[PDB]
Structure formats: C-alpha cells, structure tokens
Amino acid sequence: QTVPELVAWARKNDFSISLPVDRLSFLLAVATLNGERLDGEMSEGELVDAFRHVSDAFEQTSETIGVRANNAINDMVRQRLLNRFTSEQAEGNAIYRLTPLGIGITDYYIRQREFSTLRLSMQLSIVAGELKRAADAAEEGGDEFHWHRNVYAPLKYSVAEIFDSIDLTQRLMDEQQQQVKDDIAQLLNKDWRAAISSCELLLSETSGTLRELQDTLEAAGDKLQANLLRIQDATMTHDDLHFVDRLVFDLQSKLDRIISWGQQSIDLWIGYDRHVHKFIRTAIDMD
Amino acid sequence: SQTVPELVAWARKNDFSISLPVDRLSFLLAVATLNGERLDGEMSEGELVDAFRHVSDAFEQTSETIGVRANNAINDMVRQRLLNRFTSEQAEGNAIYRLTPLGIGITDYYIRQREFSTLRLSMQLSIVAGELKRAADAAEEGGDEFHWHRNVYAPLKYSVAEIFDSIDLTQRLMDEQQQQVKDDIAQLLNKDWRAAISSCELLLSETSGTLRELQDTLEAAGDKLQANLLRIQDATMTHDDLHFVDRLVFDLQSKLDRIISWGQQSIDLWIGYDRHVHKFIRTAIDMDKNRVFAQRLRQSVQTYFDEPWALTYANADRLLDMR
Amino acid sequence: DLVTIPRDVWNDIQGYIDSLERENDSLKNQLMEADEYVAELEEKLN
Amino acid sequence: RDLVTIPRDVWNDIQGYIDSLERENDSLKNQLMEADEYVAELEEKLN
Amino acid sequence: VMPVKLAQALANPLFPALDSALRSGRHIGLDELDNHAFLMDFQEYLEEFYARYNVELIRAPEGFFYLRPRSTTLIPRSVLSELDMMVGKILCYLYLSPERLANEGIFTQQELYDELLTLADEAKLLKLVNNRSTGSDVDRQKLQEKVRSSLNRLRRLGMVWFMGHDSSKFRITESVFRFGADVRAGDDPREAQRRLIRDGEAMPI
Amino acid sequence: EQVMPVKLAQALANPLFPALDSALRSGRHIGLDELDNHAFLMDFQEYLEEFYARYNVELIRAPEGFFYLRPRSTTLIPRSVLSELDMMVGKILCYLYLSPERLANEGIFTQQELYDELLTLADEAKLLKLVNNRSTGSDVDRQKLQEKVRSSLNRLRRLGMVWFMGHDSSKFRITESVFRFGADVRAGDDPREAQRRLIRDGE
C-alpha cells in the first residue's frame, strides 16, 4: 500500500529544517544561556547580545548586527524552533522560549548522556510495578469509567513513555558502539603494535556490556509479557474493550522489537570481533 | 559586556550542521513511517531505496538518476549523524540502517501528534512523588557509602530529573497549543467581522480555565516535592563526603522553582492578550460591521494624491524669552 | 520631594528622548552633506 | 498597575533636556530649509 | 459671577497641566485615566469656558477629546504637510489590520515603512523627497529618516505612545480615528471633503 | 481646599480677560497705553500673581509700570528664545527712546533711521556672520540683512514694545516698555556710554 499521502501532506505544509553552522551555533548559545538564568525567560535584548557574540566569533560585519539578528529570529520563528510571547514590561518588549523541537535538538548536542545499566534497571523496576498495578486493577473489573481511568490511562500515558525511553537508551548504546568502532580505527591506524592491546581491551569491554544488557532485558521481559498476557486474557472476557485490546497488541509488538534488537546487535558484534581479529592476524602480526 | 564564545568556537571546529530541505525531510519521514510499520525493526538498504523511489516520484525528479542521487543523499545523512549503518554479514552493500536519537526526536515532533492532557501531568507527578518519598526515607535511615550511592544518588540522578524534564516538555506543548489558538483567532476574525465574536469569546475563556487548572495542580504538588528535597538536604548536611548529592539537590530545586514561576507569568500574559482582544472588538468591530471603512481607506490612500488636503489642530504661540 | 509617575509615562518619556536624540544626530549629518554639496557645486562652477 | 518614584532634582533634568533638543531641532530645520533655498537658486542659475 | 462647578474644577490641582497641554493641540485618549476622568466629570462647564476663548471643544464618538479653533479664534491654528497625513492614514490602517492581533498593538517602524511603499506611487513620494531621486538607495534612506521625523512630530500631538528604551517601536492610540473623517460618510469623498472644510475640520491645500 | 477667593472669580469673570490671558501667555509687555488693560491689571494684580504661580510663572510688574511674565526653569508652558540679532534690535530701540528729539518727533521714527543706526553702531563682520555664515560681504547680503531686520522689527511689534502708525508700516512709535532691554544699564551714568560699553563687550 502506497506512501505518497504522507509526502504530499508534508509538501503541502512546507515542513523543513535549515541550520548551517553559524545558525546552529547561535541556537546552542541561546540554549546554554537559557540554562543558567533563574527567571526562566529571556528577552530580545539578550538574544541580540548572543548574536553579537557569534558574529564576533565568525568575523562578520558589526554594522548590520541588529538587522541580521532580527532576520535570524524571524527565520527561527518561521521554522518553529522558538515561541514569541509579547511582554511590554520586558527589555525589548518580547519574551522568547524554546519549543519542543528546539529542546529535542539542543539537548542532544549539549546535554551529553552515556549508557548505564542502572538506568535501565530502574526503568524496568518502575514499569514493572506500574504494569502490575494496572493488571490488578483490570482483574478487579468495573464500569466503563473504571477501565477508562484505572486501566486505559496508565497503559496509554505511563507505560508507553517508559518503553520509548528504553528504546532511546538502546539507541544511545548503538551510538556508543559506533564511537567505539571509530575509536578503534583511530587507535590502530596510529601505532599498530602499541594499539593492539587497547583494541583487545575495547572489544572485551563492549562485548561484556552487550551481554549483560541482553540478559537483564530478557529477565525483565519475561515478567512484563506475563502481565501483558494477563491483561489481555482479562479483556477478552469483555467485547466492548477493543480500545484497550489494540493498545495491548501494540505494546506486545514494541516489546518484541526491543527484545530482538539486543540479540541482533550481539550477533553483529561477534561477527565484527571475528573480522577484527582476522585483520589483526593477517596484516598486523604478519608485518 | 564581555563575551563567552568558547562553545561557538568548538562547534565551528567540529563542523556540526543540519541541512534538511523539504525533500530530505520528506525522505526521512518516509523512513520513519516504514520503520514504524514493520515488525522486525530493521531495514535493508533495498527498503530505503524503495522509499526514496516513492519520495522522488512524488517530487517529479528525473527517474534515470535515482540510484546515485539516493546513495549520495544517504551517505551525507550518515555524515550528519541521523542514520547509523550496520554491515549485516550476509549481504555487504546491503547494511541495516537505524535512526539515532536526534533523528527520532525530529521525526517524532512531526508524526507523533502530542496533545496536552492533564491526566498525564497528574500521573507523572504521583510517580515522582512516590519515588522522592522513597529517596527521602532512604536518606534519613542512613548507611555506608554504598548505601548512599545505590539508594539515594542513583534514584535522583536517573529517575527524578527525567520526570521533571517530561513535565517541562508538557508545558512546552501547552505553549504550542496557545500559539495555535492565537492563529485561529486571528484568521477567524479575518473571515467575517460580526459572526466570529461568539467563537472568540468561547475560545478565550476555555484556554484561560485550562491554564488555571494546570497551575493549581502544579503548585499543589510543588509544595510537597520541595518539602521532601529539604528533608534530603537536611539528612545529608551531617556527612562531609556527599557533596555530589548536594549539587543535584540544588539543581532540582532551581528547576522546580523555574517550572512554577513559569505558569503564573503565562497566565498574566494571557489576561493581557484577552484584554487586548476585547479592546479591538469594541473600537473597531461595531464601527464598520460591514468592512466598508477599511476598503474605502485603502482606496483613498491609493488615490490620495489626486486631491491633497490637510486637517487642523490648535497650536498656541510659544512664550518668547531672552537669554 | 519625591514624584511618583506611572510606569507607562516614564517609558514613553524615555522612548521619546531616544527617538529625538537619534533624529537630531541624523539631521546633523544631513545638514553636513547638504552644505558639502553646496560647496562642491560652487567649486566646480568656478 | 505600577508606579515609579523619583526625586525632583532628577526629574527636572529630563524635562529640560527634551525641551532643549526640540528647540535645537527646530532651529536646524529652519537652517536646512534656508540652505535648500540657496541650493535651488544655484541650480536654476546653472541651468 | 462663575458657576459653582466651573469654579470648583478650575481650582483642581490637575487643571494647569491639561490647560497647557490641550492648547498645544494634544489629543487626550482613554489611556490617561486621571485626566480623562477629570474631563468626563466636567465636560459641560469646561466646554462653556473655552467657548469664551472663541474656540470649540469636541468629543468625537470614539471617546477622545481635542480642541478645534474656529475662524475668529483667539488662539492660532496650524496644519501639517502631506507626508504627515500619509503616515497618519497608514497608522489608521494598521490599527484595523485583522492579521495584526498577533502583535497585541505593538509595532515597529520597519513595518510602517515597508507597508507605505506598497501603496504610494514610488516617484510621487520621491518627488516630495528629492526631485533627482529615481529609486536610489541614498534617497530611500533619506525618506527613511524623513518618516521618523514626521512620526516624532505626530507623537508630540499625541497619536502614538513611545515604548521602552528603544525608539524602533511604538503603540497606537484610538485618537488616530480622526484621519478617517474623509471616508466616514458613504457619499462621494469630494463633497464630504468640502463639508469637512465647511465644518472647519480641515483646510484645503 | 479653598476652591475660590471671591475676588479671583470676580476677576476671571471680567469679559475682557480672555484676550489679555492669551496675549500675556505670548509674553506681550502689556503697558499703560491700553488704559483698560492697565486698569484691569491694577484692580486684580495680587490675585493674578497668585493664580499664575500654579504654572510656575511669576507675574512681575517692572518699576516703570508695565507688566510681563517671567517663567522659571520648570515652566509648565512652553518657552522659546529669540535670536541674538533680535536682541541687538531691542537694545537699539532702547537707545532711541531716550533721544531728546523724541519729544520733537512725538516718538515717530521710520525704519530707515533704525537700519542706519544698526549699521553704523554695529560691527560689520559680526553682522555679516549673522546674515549668512557663507556670506561674501557683498550687497545682496546687506539687502537680505535689511529684510531680516524688518522681520525682527515685526516680531518685536508682536511683542508689543512698538506701535505701527496709521496704515503705513513705514511709521511707528515707541512705548516705555523698551526698558526691558535697558534694565541691564540701570546705572546712573550716560545711557549712550553704557550701551556702547555693552555692545563693545558683546553683551
């Protein structure tokens, strides 16, 4: 079944992003400055100063500072990276904030987060508790409002977000893997003999972390799927709860994807280790 | 006024950049949709190339250069760090492609229509309240360094801040809703002058009531959360080897205070807007209920020079004086 | 000895002060260039 | 609404200042007009 | 000798500021709560007093106040050039722009200038600016400065309140409705213009 | 507060007041010639001194019987300063009023005499700077100087120091109000010597 609907809609709405180096630097300075002030609100007068800093850094003309800054603000607001709140009492009569997309962008460049097993352990514990409570409440049974509040709402507004965050943590670990590959390349291409030991150390640590992750995730997933099956069995007794049944199905699918991703990545890593060691044996030791 | 461009210099050094014209963004959205629709969570290069086939045909580009164009687009996409490539050993040149956190965020902001709802806020809030109460009890009980690290520091670092960030994101969604209503209002009045009044009147009040309820809930929660943070700080004050927890407590307090002040300021701004709107209706929508005045003024200015004229205003002579 | 003024009036006074100052500074250069034009025309005529 | 409290010795300053600016601006207007008339006369003399 | 309420009002400490301001042309909008309330309480007697000066007191339907001298006034009158009238008309429009509402009534002179060049015949402003100008950048900048001078002249009369520490923004008051008297009536603008002249609102130029 | 003294109201009620008020706020030196205006001011001086004080303005009667308004640095009524050449013309008019020939001429003088007086008792270089900063010292400059001297004399006539006679502007009469430009030389020496000294010093 054909896609064109979505591309046509996006073309109609003129969705787009355009952040070359200088504009992105301005946005990062904006976010960094915002992160410090206790007011939680920044006026246009501070935006122009931030633009002045970037302009000085890029050896640009200082005579068109105001016009270029205003044009940049207009561009940002057009792309939906900022919100403009008129406030006559504020310096410049304007208050500026970051929209969700702006935060989503800037946090990843500035708010560096690396993987840690305890984070996933905590998320699994909390989500397990929430799903246990939801399954119990559903097993109790009641009126349609009872479902709407005690069963539907937890599943729709709590579990899904934690699942998405688990997926994001897995993506973070993937990024770590990519960084490890680049790092091993950089180390080995410098001083072969002197870099092989670091090569082996990095490989071993990565493999250990991957195996531990997969084991923990399997252990949690067994129980999580148990409770999901409990809620499903409970709701098959009622024909009026398709709304919950479809959500249950989607959650099962998400868990299946999450669990299979770990094993696929582990297999890829073992293959990569095999190829790396073959490379070492055939080219490194030989010469 | 001195400067701090160090971050800008570093960014300029690393050559961070994003270049997503409409076509590239459509391609990425097609990727996200297809990925969401599959049960394996993996894409072969063929699926990506087919998605690019459809996207290209939508824009009506030359059909004889799909392959090289797509390959050059995908390589740069990887360069800009939105896609990550995995060489599936069974098919070289047919690697498996997966999105990075930045790409997921960008795609989600568009596809995932997130509409603000208070039940989300209440539930997130209760969860964080329970977590913080557990943390406070653990801190008050006391123990060795391992006790602290496992039962106090890690919870605060890896659970609470996440929930507070989520609540902040919810308020940002509320901001987007307000902007939508504003736009709506604008255009609604521009359609017809006399009829729209009622609609406007309803809209305004509805948004104000929603804001009020949200702010009340936020404050009612903030009181207890701040009390618990104070409990933890007091419990830690006696030990001289736990400064890391103190810094985190300070950060959480500051973030919560900003969160609370935000809502009050926004409510005041909305009242101002409301007043403004009302003002506008009284002075302009009764006077020219049929829009004739504005059109006539347009035309008069356009043909003004055909017969200039000027009006009068009293100007008493100024007082003369010497040096 | 102390005068109280509404915020709006003080804001208006400050804005008007700045506007008038900018206008005066601009007009100074305007007169300078006009006089220079007159001088250049007189020099070229001779 | 909000108010601002100021002492007289400071308040009188801006009131003098704006008036001085206005008078100087009007004088400059007049002198510029005179110069304009002169340049117009010179231009019509040249042509 | 004097009506009781007229005497009482004249003694009010707020009077001298108004008496000096009005006779310099200033229009009084709704914003000046204290001054406007004072005028509301004592409109009849104030009107009676000034009528002895041989000048009229007018309260247009919009709700503002302004002084209009008659032919035999004991206080002079004056008018304003074409450019000022053009700027006044444009300001009148912006007040009514339905798309503006996003701006809450605050504006910027950049929009004022840009909009103006979409209506007036480019040359027909250039000639009023400089005869030799035919779209040159320098003469465009000259007009950019002339508009600011005209706007300062207008503000002195009370059509716009300045805002903040930056002159590049301002606010419009409801007293600008005066510029629409030409199009107020549905009859041919020309006869209406002559009727305005007869009423003493405007003198032909 | 004390809403109104009886005499203040009785004074403001006099039908002639409004013209007097509008003229006064223009700074005109209302003098003796206007016997009606002088009498009205005589009847209600102190109370008009009281009222105008609210405007931050002092209603001052000079020793020689004429009245004028002198504001302070904090005036609530706009004030404007006239040009220097106007002051020179004022001083010259002050000198002529003291001429013994005034009685013979009943105070009738024509603009030619005033122009000659200015030209002969004034520095040519200073005047040439006044008329036009680009002046070449030619005749056209002197003709425009005469024109602007006529304009300044007209402005002073508006101030009310002098009177135009009949229906020809060539004839005018001076009044005692001119001393406002000679009060600086109230010393008992020769008025000619004092005015010459002041003009030499540039005062």
Q: Which subunits have 3 or more CB–CB pairs within 8 Å of chain F? A: B, D, E
Q: Which residue of A has its CA nearest to E167?
A: A92
**CA distance readout (Å), B305 to A78, B105, E121, E128, F16:** 37, 56, 9, 11, 45
Start-to-end C-alpha separation, chain B: 43
Contact check, Cβ <8 Å, F82/B320: yes
Distance, CA of F61 to CA of F52 (rounded, Å): 14
Fold of E2-70: Arc Repressor Mutant, subunit A (1.10.10)
Taking a C-beta distance cutoff of 8 angstroms, is the pair E101, B280 a contact? yes
Please identify, in words, the CATH class of the domain defined by B3-114: mainly alpha
Taking a C-beta distance cutoff of 8 angstroms, is the pair B58, B48 a contact? no
Q: Which superfamily, per CATH, for A114-287?
A: Chromosome partition protein MukF, middle domain (1.20.58.590)
Distance, CA of A227 to CA of A135 (rounded, Å): 7
Query: Residues A206, A208, A211, A212: is their CA dihedral positive or negative?
Result: negative
Instruction: Give me the residues paired with residue A17 across strands.
Output: B20
Radius of gyration for the alpha carbons in chain A, expressed in angstroms and rounded: 26
Q: Which residue of E has its CA nearest to F11?
A: E1
- Please return the burial class of F189, using the count of CB atoms within 10 Å of its CB with bins 0-12, 13-18 and 19+: exposed
What are the b/e assignments for A55-88, b being 16+ CB within 10 Å?
Answer: bebeeeeeeebeebbbebbeebeebbbbbbbbbb
Fold of E80-187: Arc Repressor Mutant, subunit A (1.10.10)
Distance, CA of F44 to CA of F57 (rounded, Å): 17
Task: Using alpha carbons only, give the angle B80, B82, B85 rounded to the nearest 5 degrees.
Answer: 100
Q: How far is E12 from chain B (nearest CA, A)?
A: 23
What are the b/e assignments for A161-184, b being 16+ CB within 10 Å?
Answer: bbbebbbebbbbbbbebeebeeeb
- Token readout for A210 is 């991957």
CB-based contacts of F85, cutoff 8 Å, min separation 6:
F127, F130, F148, F149, F152
Q: Where are the beta strands (DSSP E) in E92-179?
A: 106-108, 160-162, 169-172
Do E2-70 and E80-187 share a fold?
Answer: yes
Mark residue A212 as left, alpha or beta (left: phi above 0; alpha: psi -120 to 50; beta: remaining): alpha
Nearest to F25 by CA among E19, B113, A141, B232: E19
**CA distance readout (Å), B87 to B92, B303, C40:** 6, 71, 76
- Token readout for E146 is 């002339």
Helix axis angle for B45-59 and B66-79, nearest 10°, is 110
Q: How far is F192 from chain B (nearest CA, A)?
A: 22
Optimal mutation site among D15, D17, D34, interface F, most CBs of chain F within 10 A = D15
Nearest to E164 among C15, C22, C26 (CB): C15
Residue C42 host element (H or E): helix C7-45
What are the backbone dihedrals phi and psi of residue B152, each rounded to the nearest 5 degrees, phi first? -125, -60
What are the backbone dihedrals phi and psi of residue F67, each rounded to the nearest 5 degrees, phi first? -125, 140
Asked if the C-beta of B322 comes within 8 angstroms of chain F's C-beta atoms, the answer is yes
Q: Do at least 3 CB pairs under 8 Å connect A with F?
A: no
Contact check, Cβ <8 Å, D2/C7: yes
List of chain D residues whose C-beta atoms are within 8 Å of the C-beta of residue F76: none
Q: Residue by residue, what is the 3-state secondary structure of chain A? A: CCCCHHHHHHHHHCCCEEECHHHHHHHHHHHHHHCCCCCCCEEHHHHHHHHHHHHHHCCCCCCCHHHHHHHHHHHHHHHCCEEEEECCCCCCCEEEEECHHHHHHHHHHHCCCCCCHHHHHHHHHHHHHHHHHHHHHHHHCCCHHHHHHHHHHHHHHHHHHHHHHHHHHHHHHHHHHHHHHHHHHHHHHHCHHHHHHHHHHHHHHHHHHHHHHHHHHHHHHHHHHHHHHHHHHHHCCCCCCHHHHHHHHHHHHHHHHHHHHHHHHHHHHHHHHHHHHHHHHHHHHCC
Asked if the C-beta of B6 comes within 8 angstroms of chain E's C-beta atoms, the answer is no
Optimal mutation site among D23, D24, D30, interface F, most CBs of chain F within 10 A = D23
Contact check, Cβ <8 Å, C23/D18: no
| DSSP helix/strand/coil, E47 | helix
Contact check, Cβ <8 Å, E17/F78: no
Contact check, Cβ <8 Å, C18/E167: yes
Distance, CA of E66 to CA of E94 (rounded, Å): 22
Nearest to F203 by CA among F72, F91, F121: F91
**CA distance readout (Å), B303 to B33, B297, B299, B307, F134:** 55, 10, 6, 8, 43
Domain ranges of chain D: 1-47
DSSP state of B18: E
Contact check, Cβ <8 Å, B312/E201: yes
CB-based contacts of D22, cutoff 8 Å, min separation 6:
C20
Task: Using alpha carbons only, give the angle F87, F89, F93 rounded to the nearest 5 degrees.
Answer: 115
Taking a C-beta distance cutoff of 8 angstroms, is the pair C19, E148 a contact? yes
Domain ranges of chain A: 2-113, 114-287
In the sheet with E106-108, reading across from the earlier edge strand, the strands are E106-108, E169-172, E160-162
Architecture of domain F82-189: Orthogonal Bundle (1.10)
Contact check, Cβ <8 Å, E106/A88: yes
State the amino acid at position B79 in one-letter form: R
What are the backbone dihedrals phi and psi of residue B87, each rounded to the nearest 5 degrees, phi first? -80, 95
Q: Which subunits have 3 or more CB–CB pairs within 8 Å of chain B? A: A, E, F
- Token readout for E177 is 């409705």
- Please return the burial class of D32, using the count of CB atoms within 10 Å of its CB with bins 0-12, 13-18 and 19+: middle
Fold of A2-113: Arc Repressor Mutant, subunit A (1.10.10)
Q: What is the dihedral of CA E93, E94, E96, E99, to 10 degrees?
A: 130
Beta pairing, strands B309-311 & E66-69: unpaired
- Token readout for F67 is 């009245």
Q: Which residue of E has its CA nearest to C6?
A: E32
List of chain C residues whose C-beta atoms are within 8 Å of the C-beta of residue D38: 38
What are the backbone dihedrals phi and psi of residue B19, each rounded to the nearest 5 degrees, phi first? -140, 95
Contact check, Cβ <8 Å, B302/E124: no
Radius of gyration for the alpha carbons in chain E, expressed in angstroms and rounded: 19
How many other C-beta atoms lie within 10 A of the C-beta of residue B252?
Answer: 19
**Could you tell me how many CB contacts below 8 A there are between chain B and chain F?**
35
Contact check, Cβ <8 Å, E164/C27: no
What are the backbone dihedrals phi and psi of residue E55, each rounded to the nearest 5 degrees, phi first? -135, 155
Radius of gyration for the alpha carbons in chain B, expressed in angstroms and rounded: 30
Say which residue the tokens 């400065």 belong to: E145
Helix axis angle for E122-129 and E82-96, nearest 10°, is 140
Asked if the C-beta of F202 comes within 8 angstroms of chain E's C-beta atoms, the answer is no
Contact check, Cβ <8 Å, D23/F81: yes
Please identify, in words, the CATH class of the domain defined by B115-309: mainly alpha
Distance, CA of E163 to CA of B187 (rounded, Å): 27
Start-to-end C-alpha separation, chain D: 63
Task: Using alpha carbons only, give the angle F92, F96, F99 rounded to the nearest 5 degrees.
Answer: 150
Distance, CA of B43 to CA of B94 (rounded, Å): 9
Method: cryo-EM
Distance, CA of A205 to CA of A198 (rounded, Å): 11
List of chain C residues whose C-beta atoms are within 8 Å of the C-beta of residue D35: 31, 34-35, 38
Nearest to A21 among B15, B40, B179 (CB): B15
Contact check, Cβ <8 Å, F77/E2: no
Contact check, Cβ <8 Å, A93/E165: no
Q: Which residue of E has its CA nearest to C16?
A: E162
Got the DSSP string for chain F?
-----HHHHHHHTSTTHHHHHHHHHTT----SSSHHHHHHHHHTHHHHHHHHGGGTEEEEE-TTS-EEEEE-TT-SS-EEE--HHHHHHHHHHHHHHT-THHHHHTTEE-HHHHHHHHHHHS-HHHHHHHH-TT--SSHHHHHHHHHHHHHHHHHHHHHTSEEE-TT-TT-EEE-GGGGGGTGGG-SSS-HHHHHHHHHHHT-
Taking a C-beta distance cutoff of 8 angstroms, is the pair F32, F38 a contact? yes
Domain ranges of chain F: 4-72, 82-189
Q: How far is E150 from chain B (nearest CA, A)?
A: 14
Contact check, Cβ <8 Å, B322/F81: yes
How many other C-beta atoms lie within 10 A of the C-beta of residue A50?
Answer: 24
Contact check, Cβ <8 Å, C18/E163: no
Please identify, in words, the CATH class of the domain defined by F4-72: mainly alpha
- Token readout for A73 is 């603000």
Start-to-end C-alpha separation, chain E: 43
